[PDB]
């Protein structure tokens, strides 16, 4: 049953300082905003995902990006803790700057960068995160993540 | 390493995915797996000394994450006492399209895997997200090079539990 995780919206800061934000918009879709980090400023609406419940309070959000980045987030909701593996093509660990946009406006651009690569070797980032903020926005709220990070109010 | 991983390191287990594929993993140490694919698209494939990221996410919830010389990336969440596993696998297009090219003792064909990797095509990624039942599960201790030391076909009589 995914009802537990669908609509969950949270900000979470990885052990390496990166402040990420997810809204699980439905059983197969997240929005996300990166506030801090390698790719701070980057955000994404309607990222197609695999979401599954691995046990009671252990959800997994799995996806591949137009950049070629693959991601598997284990989200432990009640425990307010998260683990992300990020499989960055070499060209995003090297030159992440073009990926820092509203991606939905630059999908063919991202795939063009993706295709020339270099894809290999992959740069894997495995980090725990503390979930600092967490709320239920319900399904299909396009207003949860509808701006870049810096365009949020100073208390968010 | 603090005690968090001691409940997963040394764990050797065979498991069958929702889609029928029998996989086998031995967590050989805090940063290394061996694995043996009995069945599936990549049945017969096996791997020694795969660099891996293991972490404990909760009690009985381990996460094991790696990228291969093929460009395949994997994150398996392992729930050991519940005898259940989940794997996401990020297959370069050329592995979903020509998985045979990857069905070997990879250690003896690493450059071949990287040549296929480099040749591509890498994209689009074929994401495979499946639950699996862990059907056999034992502790083989750390750094045992014997537990996965042959292909599935050269295993002994009744090695499937």
Numbering used by the authors:
A (entry chain A): 8 to 163
B (entry chain B): 5 to 165
Give the original sentences from the paper that presented this experimental model.
Enzymatic decarboxylation of biobased hydroxycinnamic acids gives access to phenolic styrenes for adhesive production. To date, several PADs have been biochemically analyzed and structurally characterized. PADs adopt the lipocalin fold, and the core of the protein is formed by two mutually perpendicular β-sheets. In solution, a homodimer is formed by two monomers that are related by an improper 2-fold axis. In this study, we used ancestral sequence reconstruction to generate thermostable decarboxylases.
The relatively recent ancestor N31 has a significantly higher thermostability (Tm = 78.1 °C) than proteins from more distant clades, such as N2 (Tm = 56.1 °C) or N4 (Tm = 55.2 °C). Notably, although N31 did not evolve from thermophilic bacteria, it has a much higher thermostability and can perform decarboxylation reactions at temperatures exceeding 60 °C. We also aimed to improve the thermostability of N31 further using the publicly available PoPMuSiC server. To gain a better understanding based on their activity and stability, we determined the structures of N31, N55, and N134 via X-ray crystallography. The models for the remaining ancestors were predicted using AlphaFold 2.41 N31, N55, and N134 were crystallized with one, two, and three homodimers in the asymmetric unit at a resolution of 3.1, 1.6, and 2.5 Å, respectively. The ancestral PAD N31 showed high activity in DES/water mixtures and maintained activity in the presence of 70% (v/v) DES/buffer and at 60 °C, while BsPAD can perform decarboxylation in 50% (v/v) DES/buffer and at 30 °C. This allows applications in homogeneous solutions, which is beneficial, among others, for continuous flow setups. In contrast, N31 shows a specific activity of 50 U/mg at 60 °C, a temperature where the half-life time exceeds days. N31 retained its stability for more than 3 days, while under the same conditions, BsPAD rapidly lost its activity, preventing reliable half-life time determination. In addition to the half-life time, the thermal stability of the enzyme also increased in DES. Both N31 and BsPAD exhibited an ∼6 °C increased unfolding temperature in 70% (v/v) DES/buffer as determined by circular dichroism spectroscopy. N31 is a phenolic acid decarboxylase with unparalleled thermostability, allowing it to work under conditions of higher temperature and thus much better substrate solubility, which is a critical factor for the space-time yield of a biocatalytic process.
